[PDB]
Every structure is written in C-alpha cells, then in structure tokens.
Structure 1
C-alpha cells in the first residue's frame, strides 16, 4: 500500500520480513553509513535511476533517456531508431542540461522547523510550505558556507503530512552524465502510445548512462578530463528471475498523491477535473482522428499532438473508473467520519471544523473551477490558434525609430512557430468549431472571454462563420495575409485583428480565473495540516503514508497479476513470444527489431531465459508507485536488481487517492530482458562485464 519515508523503514521492517524481505535493515537504509539507498538517483529531475557498476553505470527507462538519445540522433546516425551502443567509454556521449541527484543524508528537522515557525505571528501565513522560507531554514542549519566546505553537496527542507513533519535532505548532484546505451525505439518503446498504461506489457523500456566526475569523484560539469565515478554503492544484478508471490520492493521519487482528499475533493476531481478533460479531449481527438484518417499528410502533422492529448485522457478515464467502481468517495467519507467521531469523543472540535472548511472551500470555488477547466481544456489546449502571436508592448510601441522591421521580424518568427510544418489551419478551424460549440453551450454569455461574445452578437450564433472570419481577416490566417501585413504594418490593424483579439481575450479570461481561484488553495492547505494531524494522532503512521512530494520513498509488495474483469486474468509475467504475437510491420508502433526476432527464432537466450526455456520481458507487482517512479530499481528479497519500473496499469491510476489492492500494479521491465538486449541486440559485452551479476 504505501510510499514510505526512509525514516519509516525501522517501523516497517518486521512487516517487510514477514512478507519475505531477507536483507538486513541497515544494508537497505542506514542513516549513518553506506546502504542500498546510496545506489538510487533522481535522474534528470523527474525520473529515478540506479547505479549498477563500480564505474558509475546507471540504468533508467528509455522514455527517461529519450530526449538525450534524440539530441544525439542525426540522419547519418539515428540512435532513436537503431539504438546506441558505445563500444568504449570514450565513445559515451555527453549531455547538456542533465543531472543525477544522490540522497547523501536525510534528517528529521520537525522540532527545529516548528520552533522557527513560532516567530511567524500571522497564524494563516503560508511560510510553513514556502520553498524560499524552508531554504533559509535549511541554510541556517547547514551553515554559512556549506556548499563551499562540502562541494557538490546541497541542502533542502521539505514539508510532509500537510506540514506536520519536516525532513532535511543533503543532496549530491552530478551534471556530467553520458549516454552509454539504448535499445532501438522498436524495443524501448515497443507498445508506443497503444500500450501506454497497459498490462500485459511487452516493452523493453530501458536506457544506460554513466556518471562522470573529477579525479576525486567530486561533481563537475562536462570536461574531456572527467573520469567515471566510483560510487560507494551499486546494485548487484540478479539472474534468478521472478516467480508469482515473490517479494519485490522499489525505491524512487514518487511526485504527487492525494491520499488525504476529503470526499468533496474526490467529487470535485470527478465532476469537474476529470469529466471536463474527458468530454473536451474526446471532442478534440474525434475531430483530429477523422482528419488524420482522411489525409496521410494530416496524420504525419497531427500524430504527436493526438498522442499527447490521449495520455492524460486515458489517465482521467482510469481515475473516473476507480471513483465509479472502487468506492473512493465513500472511503474518504468514512475516513473523515471516523476522525470527526474521535474528535467529538476527545472534546476537540478542530478536526470537524477543518473538514468543514475544506468542504466549504470546494463548494465555493465550484463555478470558477468549472470555468477554468472548461477554458483550459476547451481552448488553451483545445484550439491551436489560441496560441497564435500576440504583439508585445515593445512591438506595438515601435510599429506606432525605423525599428519597425525588428518588431516585424520578431512577430514573423512567432507566426512561423505557430503556423509551422505541422500546423493545418483547416484542421484547426474544424477542431475550433467543435470545441467552441461545446464551450459556448457550457459557459454563459456573461462568463465568456470578451471576443467569444461576438458569436451571439455579430455572427447570429454561427460558430463556423465566426471561426471562418478569424482566418479570413487575420494577418495570421495565412502566409499571404501575414506578408501583406508585414509590407504595410499598422498598430490599428493588429489592435482590430480577430485572431489577436481571440487569443488575447481567451488568455485574459484564463489568467483572471487562475488569479480568482488561487486564494482558495491556502484555506484547504491550512485545514489539511489540522486534518492530517488528527488522522495521525488518532491512528498513527502504519496505513497512513505521507503524500508523495518528489522525495525518496520505498514501497514493497509481491510479483502478482490481477483480474481486470469477470473471467479474465492477467498473470504476473510477459514473454518474448508476446512481442512476436504483437508484431505488425505495417504499424510503426509494433515493428519488431530484426536482430530480436532472430534471437527469438534461434532461442539464443543464454542464461537469460526462465527455467522452462521461455524468454521473460516484463512483470508486474503490488508495489505502490506513481509518476516520478519511472526507472526505479526493483529489488529481490535480497536487494538484488530484478527489474526497472516503467509504467502502471490504467486500472490502478486512482491509486494516487486510494491504493487498489486487486487492480493496481507497477509494470516493470525484467532485468533478464535488459541484459538479453544489451548482449544479443547491442552486442555491448563490456557493460555486462562491468556489472556484478549474481547466479
């Protein structure tokens, strides 16, 4: 069930041992010594990674290393398509703007932060959650010259349990992290978007990097003189595999959860956030798909925009399925009713008052939040010409010196970025007519962005005519229309431009709604500090893990499949046969790498196949993970690496609010499949030789 703080390992250890854990507590996490924790990294600010050799080799997902593989790909050496395998350390490619963060030390600073907070005075101050305020406290505790006296090291204080617990992290950051290896995209992204959030899964989602440092192993930016880091700890690789019911554990950096939502917040998330995202994205995607299917050139131009929209659409469908069928609302209601009864018994009414303040705040912002999601989903992300060029103050106060051409050059650059090779004005007009029709039906005239009032006032309710007019008369409606404006530019033309007025008007409403909604966050936050305080005083920390906040957490469970629906069972493990069943050479998402197909045909699995001679690909576990856990090391009962987490099934996405024991699984790439690909596909033997592989 939980995403536990490293501090909570002591209190969970006996439960973990009864579940199968065999390694000693301090070998996994030792607060004053080297432990497995020291081999885990926050990879490039989002993902998790792990050190797997005494020469700083790091494993993470392919989707985590995707941008670096793409930045080094050219028509001559397309690493994204064919994979990359540096045959020597000197061939490993440096990456600009990359980082790996080690969690050197973790300290409970709750009493210290709570003493400092007593000097606030204003009771409803938000300094207790301010990164700027907590950084001043962190700096004060570490010293006046900490990062100079301990180079590469930094400190950070974070709030947990709604402001009831504070931890200080001493971090070591390395910025010379080089690309070492990657399978082709056909393996690394096998299912592509079709299999996103899907179990069974057949994707070899991995990529390999190496941390470099100065001669003393201290962090240093890229330099040809940098040498591979010798870490204090690295993971041993297991080739023993997994079996159903085996203990599995993960360490990583889950980003966000909402485990302490009130029942009213679950209803708001369903009826506003999720229903609007689902309704608006289905309209947008439906028009896009029709146009992509009708024109091959439209499919090329809009495939990525279609796939980007679908990702959170699928998440919202999964989340709403949990709200509808797994009693998320009812379970939050029971949680808060239990606290209210306990507070009444003890004579402390502050807990019931805190739940009431959250409910009152949620009910109060309903119309505003609905208007915000409607404009964000319907127009801000729904309509491409909402992000068309808007003349800046310095551009208009230049068009009306001869720096008129400089202003035109800047506006032209933005027009060319809006109307780029992938933009179709015809597809955008079709999407806008469908999206605005829905938007205008849901948002009353008095709440419309000013320009949209012209649909009723000037265009007799004809959305198609209003959209046609924007493109017919706008300087950004076509290249010829822009060039005619650029030849004779006037501020008067820009000020009355229908597309400029649309874009300005919709962004004005979007910012006004955001500014009007921001003040509702703080009362909920303050009430949650009291709410979680009561929940913890009443039941303690055993089932009540702290919400994820991009900090190092551990989770444990077992390798186990699940039943998605009546009479259907998904087992715990997928195989290479499953990749071959999915092969479709005429669908780019399901093309199979010819070298991998030959490995399957000749059964050239070496020591990587399971006892029955079948080649494993992926497995799933009852660990509790979320976004930020991509690339996380998956460990055995002995702490040996058995896989890398890379996804979670859609049926478990509601697990950010309520863990779903019978449906929620972490989707993990089997380490035996990773090694099979490095070996038989990449032929990169030196990477296998530098790892410590246990029989």
Structure 2
C-alpha cells in the first residue's frame, strides 16, 4: 500500500521480514554507509535506472531510452527498428542532454526548516513549499561553496506530508551516459499503444546505457577521455526467477500521488478533470480515426497525435472506473470523518476547519475549473489551428526599416512548423467543427473566448461556416495564402486575420482562467498541511505514506496475479508463447522479431527458461508504483535483480488516490527475458560477462 521514505525502512523492516525479506536492513538502505540504494538512479529526470556492473552499466526501460535510440538512428542504421548492440565500449554512443542522478545522502531537516519558517511575518506565506526558499535553506545548511568543495554533488530540500516533514538530499549527477544496447522496437515496444496499461503484457521494455566519468570516477561532461564509472554498488542479476507469492520490492522515483484528497476533491477529479478529458478526447479521437481509416496518408500523418491523445484518455477511463467501482470517494469521506470525530474528542477544531476550507475552495472554483478544462481539452489540445502563428509585438513593430523581411522569415518559420508534413487542414477543420460544437454547447456566450462569439453573432450559429471562413480568409489557411501575405504584408491584415484572432482569443481566455484559478491552490495547500498533520497525529506515520514528489521511495509486495472481472483470472507471469499468440505481421505493433521467433521455435532458451521449459517474459506484483517508477529495479527477498518495472495495469491507475490490493499491479519485464534478448537477439556476450549473475 505505500511509497515509503528511505527513513521509514527501520519502521517497516519487521513487516518486510514477515513478508519474506531476507537481506539485512543496512544492506538495503544505510544512512551512513554503502547499501543497495547506491545502485539506483534517476534516469534522464523522469525515469528510474539501476547500475548492474562494476563498470557502470545501467538498465532502464526501452521507452526511457527511446529518445536517445531515436537521436542515434538514421536511414542507414535504424537502431529504433533494428535495435543496437555496441560490440566494444568504444562503440557506445554518447548522448547530449542526458543525466543520471545518484542519491548519495538523505537527511531529515524538519526541525531546521520549521525553525527557519518561524521567522514568518505572514501566516499565509507559501515559502514552506517554495523551491527557491527551500534551496536558500539547503545552501545555508550545506555551506557557502559546497559544490566547489565536493564536485559533482548538489543539495536539495523537499517538503513531505503537506509541509510536515522536510528531507535534504545530497545528489551526485553524471552527464556522460552512453547508449550501449537496445532491443528492436518490435520487442521493446511489442504491445505498442494497444497493450499500454494492459496486463497480461508481453513487452521486452528494456535498454542499456553506461555511466562514464573522469579518471577518479567523478562526474564529468562528455569527453573522449572519459572512462566507465566503477560504482560503489551494483545489483547482482538473479537467474532463479519468480514464483507466485514471492516477495518483491522496488526502489524508484514515483512522481505524484493524491493519497490525502478529500471526498470533494475526488468528486471534482471525476466530474470535471476526468469527464471533460474523456468527453473531449472521445470527440477528437473519433474524427481522427474516421479520417485515418479513410485515407492511408492521413493515418501516416496522424498516428502519433492519435496515440498521444489516447494515453491520458485511457488513464482517465481507468481512474473513473475506480471512482465508480472501488469506493474511492467513500473511503476519503470515512478518512476525514474519523479525523473530525477524533478532533472533536480532543477539543481541537482545526482539522474539521481544514477539511471545510478544502471543500469550500473546491466548491468556489468549480465553474472556473470547468471552463479551464473545457478550453484546454476542447481547443488548446483539441484543435491544431489554436497553436497557429501569432505575430509577436516585435514582429508587428517591424512590419509597421528593411527588417520587415526578417519578421516575415520568423513568421514563415512558425507557419511551416504549424503546417508541417503531418498537418492536414481538412482533418483539422473536421476536428474543430466537432470540438467547437461541443465547446459552444457547454460554455455560455458571456464566458466564450471573444472570437468564438462570432459563431452566434456573424455566422448564425453555423460552426462549419465559421471554421471554413477562418481557413478561407486566413494568411495561414494555405501555403499560397501565406505567400500572398508575405509578398504584401500589412499589420492591418494580421490584426484582422481570423486564424490569428481565434488563436489569440483562445490563448487569452486560457491564460485568464489559469490566473484566476491559481489563487485557489494556496488555501487547499495550507489546509492540507493541517489535515495531514492531524491524520499523522491520530493514526501515525506507518500505513499513511507521504505523497510521491519525485524522490526515492521503496515499495514491497508479492509476485501475484488478480481477477479483473467475474470468472476471469490473470496469472502472475507471461511467457514467450504469449508473444507468438499475439503475432500479426500486417499490424506494426504486433510484429515479431525474426531472430526471437527462431529462438522460440528452437527452444534456444539456455539458462533463462523456467523449470517447466517455458520462457518467461513479464510478471506482475502488488508493489505500489506510479509514473516515475518506469525503469525501476525489482528485487528478490535477497536484493537480487529479478526484473524491471515498466508499467501498471489500468485497473490500478486510481491507486494514486487509493491503493487497490485486489486490482493494482506493477507490470515488470522479467530479467531472464532481458538476458535472453541480449544473448540470443543482440549477441552481446560482453554485457552478460560484466554482470554478476547468481545461479
């Protein structure tokens, strides 16, 4: 049920041991010594990774190393579709803008931060959650020139439990992280978008990198003279596999959770956030699909935009399923009613007052929040011509010196980025007509972006005519229309351009709503500090985990399947047989790598198949994970690497608010399948040889 602070390992150790943990507490996390924690990294600012060799080899997900594989792929060597396997360390490819962060030390600085905060002057100050303020405190505690005295290191203070606990992290950052190996996209992304959030899963979601450093193992930017890092700790790889009910644990960097939402916040998340995103994306995706299915060239141009919209659409469907079926609202109501009753008993009304302040703030911002999600889902992300070019104050104060041609070249560059190879004005007009029809029926005339008032005023309610007119008369309606403008540009033409005015109007309203809604966050945040303090004072800091905030956490559970619906059971482990059953040569998502298909036919599984001769692929566990846990190491009761976390099932996406023991699972690629792909698909024996593989 939790994403626990490293500091909470002492308090949790006895329960973990009763659940199967065999390793010593300080071998997993030592606050003043080397531990397994030292082999975990924050990979490229949003994924987790792990050191698996004495020469700095790092494993993470394929979707985590995707951009680096794509940036090194060309028409001649397409590493994205064929994979990549450096046969020597010197062949490993450097990556620009990459990083790996080690969590060198973690300290509780609560009394320090709470004493510094006492120098208040304003009870409603938000400095207690300010990265700028907390950084000034972190620097004060570390010292004037800490990063110069300790190079490669940096400090950071973060708030936890709504501002009731503060931790300082001493981080070590390496920026020379090189691509070593990756399976083909057919393995690394087998399910592709059809199996996203799905269990059973058959995806070999892994990629291999290597941390490089200077001669002393100190952080250094890319240089041809950099040497692989010899880390202070790396994971041993287990080949013993997994069995149902086996103890499993994960360390990683979960991004966000909302475990202390009030019942009113659950209703708002359902009725505004999720219902609007669901309704608007269903309209958008419906029109896109119709057009993609009717024209194979539209399918090529819109496949990625369609897939990108489906991802949070599916998450919202999964989250609304939990609100409707798992009693999320009710359990938050029971949590707050229990605190209110205990507060009344102790003669302290501040907890009930705090819950009331949250409810009243939610109720007060309802119409504004509805208008914001409606314009964001409906227009800002729903309609492509909302992000069409808007002339800057510098560009209009140039068109009306010969810098007029420099303004036109800047506007032209933006126009070509909007109307790119994947942009269809006809498809966009069809999407806009459906999106705006829904938007105009939900947002009243007095709340509309100024230009959308023309639908009723000038176009007699004809949405099609309004959209047709934007493209017919706009300088960004077609290439020829832009060129005619570029030849004779006047500021009066841009000031009255229907597409410019639409884009300006919708962005003006989007920004006005954001600015009007931002002040409502602070009373909720301040009341949550009091609310979570009461919850901790009442039921204790053990069962109630602090919300995720991109900091290192541990979670434990077991390798276990679940029943998704009546009379259906999904086991704990998928096999290579499941990849073969899913093969569809004429569906790019489910194509099987020929070398992998041959390995399966010949049963060339070596030391990686299970005791029954079946080749495992993936497994699931009752660990509590979220976004940010993407390439997390999964450990045995002995702390050996058994897999890599890569996803979670849609039935558990509501788990960011309320953990669902009977449904929520972490989706993990089996380490035996990782080694089988490195060995029989990549033929990269040197990577197997540098790992410490235990029988």
TM-score (norm 2): 1.00
The aligned residue for residue 583 of structure 1 is 583
Residue 228 of structure 1: how far off its partner (Å): 0.2
- What secondary structure, in the 3-state scheme, does the structure 2 residue paired with 1:335 have? helix
Distance 2:467 2:120 in 1: 53
Structure 2 CA distance, aligned partners of 1:212 and 1:250? 25
Cα separation, 2, equivalents of 1:474 and 1:145: 56
DSSP-derived class of the 1:668 partner: strand
Deviation at 1:184, TM superposition (A): 0.2
Q: 1:546 deviation in Å? A: 0.1
Secondary structure of the residue aligned to 1:103 is strand
* Cα displacement (A) at 1:543: 1.0
Shift of 1:120: 1.5
- Give 3-state SS (helix, strand or coil) of 2:597's partner: helix
Displacement of 1:598 in angstroms is: 0.1
Instruction: Report the Cα offset of residue 126 of structure 1.
Output: 0.3
Q: Give me the whole-angstrom Cα distance separating, in 2, the residues matched to 1:253 and 1:370.
A: 31
Please name the residue that 2:216 is paired with.
Answer: 216
Q: Give the C-alpha shift of residue 323 in structure 1.
A: 0.1
Look up the match of 1:487.
Answer: 487
Partner of 1:438: 438
CA–CA separation in structure 2 for the residues paired with 1:34 and 1:270: 45
The alpha carbon displacement at 1:118 in A equals 0.3
Question: Secondary structure, in 3 states, of the residue corresponding to 1:154?
Answer: strand
How far, CA to CA, are the matches of 1:120 and 1:45 in structure 2?
A: 33
Cα shift at 1:121: 1.5
Offset at residue 125 of structure 1 (A)? 0.1
Q: Distance in 2 between matches of 1:166 and 1:247?
A: 30
Cα displacement (A) at 1:409: 0.3
Deviation at 1:86, TM superposition (A): 0.2
Q: Deviations for 1:524-546, whole angstroms, at most 9, x for unmatched residues?
A: 00000000000000000121000
Output the CA distance in 1 between the equivalents of 2:418 and 2:551.
37
User: CA offsets, 1:80-139, max 9 Å, x none?
Assistant: 000000000000000000000000000000000000000011000000000000000000
Give the superposition deviation at 1:29: 0.1
Q: Distance in 2 between matches of 1:655 and 1:543?
A: 15
Q: Matches of 2:274 and 2:46 in 1, distance apart?
A: 24
Instruction: Kindly report which structure 2 residues correspond to 1:289-300, keeping only aligned pairs within 5 A, or say none.
Output: 289-300=289-300
After TM superposition, give the deviation of residue 424 of structure 1 in Å.
0.2
**Counterparts in 2 of 1:376-525, with a 5 A limit?**
376-525=376-525
Counterpart mapping for 1:277-676 below 5 A: 277-676=277-676
Q: 1:19-46 CA distances to partner (integer Å, 9 max, x unpaired)? A: 0000000000000000000000000000
Distance 1:531 1:357 in 2: 10
Determine the C-alpha separation between the residues in 1 that align with 2:402 and 2:5.
62
Runs of 4+ in 1 over 6 A off after TM superposition: none
Distance 1:464 1:171 in 2: 55
Q: In structure 1, how many angstroms separate the alpha carbons of the residues matched to 2:416 and 2:137?
A: 47
Secondary structure in structure 2 of the residue aligned to 1:365: helix
The superposition leaves residues 339-388 of structure 1 with CA deviations (integer Å, 9 ceiling, x where unpaired) of 00000000000000000000000000000000000000000000000000
2: CA distance between counterparts of 1:157 and 1:285? Answer: 42
Q: CA deviation at 1:450?
A: 0.2
Q: CA deviation at 1:517?
A: 0.1
- Cα deviation per residue 1:535-577 (whole Å; 9 max; x = unaligned)? 0000001210000000000000000000000000000000000
C-alpha distance in 1 between matches for 2:145 and 2:490: 56
The CA RMSD measured in Å over matched residues stands at 0.2
CA distance, structure 2, for counterparts of residue 403 and residue 28 of structure 1: 63
- CA offsets, 1:281-332, max 9 Å, x none? 0000000000000000000000000000000000000000000000000000
CA distance in 1 between counterparts of 2:543 and 2:232 reads 33
SS in 1 for 2:578: helix
Query: Gapped runs of 5+ residues in structure 1?
Result: none
Structure 2 Cα separation of the partners of residues 269 and 34 of structure 1? 42
Partner SS, residue 630 of structure 2: coil
Three-state SS of the structure 2 residue aligned to 1:168 is strand
- SS class of match (2:230): coil
Q: What is the CA distance between 1:249 and its match in structure 2?
A: 0.1
**CA deviation vs aligned residue, 1:50-98 (integer Å, no higher than 9, x gap):** 0000000000000000000000000000000000000000000000000
Cα distance, 1:223 vs. partner? 0.2
- Measure the CA separation in 2 of the matches of 1:614 and 1:325: 36
The alpha-carbon deviation at position 608 of structure 1 amounts to 0.1
CA distance in 2, matches of 1:417, 1:112: 50
Alpha-carbon distance in 2 for matches of 1:483, 1:136 = 52
Distance across 1 between alignment mates of 2:407 and 2:140 = 47
Distance 1:339 1:99 in 2: 43
Give the TM-score, by structure 1 length: 1.00
2:154 partner SS:
strand
CA distance in 1 between counterparts of 2:420 and 2:562 reads 45
Distance 1:561 1:441 in 2: 45
How far the C-alpha of 1:522 sits from its partner, in A, is: 0.2
Quick check: 1:63 aligned with 2:102?
Answer: no
SS of equivalent residue, structure 1 residue 542: coil
1 CA distance for matches of 2:163 and 2:290? Answer: 49
1:649 to partner: Cα distance: 0.2
Local SS of the residue matching 1:461:
coil
Which secondary structure does the structure 2 equivalent of 1:76 belong to?
Answer: coil
- Tell me the distance in 2 between the aligned counterparts of 1:479 and 1:168: 55
Give the superposition deviation at 1:402. Answer: 1.1
- Output the CA distance in 2 between the equivalents of 1:540 and 1:19: 21
* 1:333 shift after superposition: 0.2
Q: What is the distance in 2 between the residues matched to 1:76 and 1:420?
A: 24
- How far apart are the structure 1 equivalents of 2:598 and 2:23? 39
Q: After superposition, what is the alpha-carbon deviation per residue over 1:579-606, rounded to whole angstroms, capped at 9, x for unaligned?
A: 0000000000000000000000000000
- The DSSP-based 3-state class of the residue aligned with 2:668 is strand
CA distance in 2 between counterparts of 1:542 and 1:115 reads 25
- After superposition, give the CA deviation of every residue in 1:468-504 in whole Å (9 maximum; x if it has no partner): 0000000000000000000000000000000000000
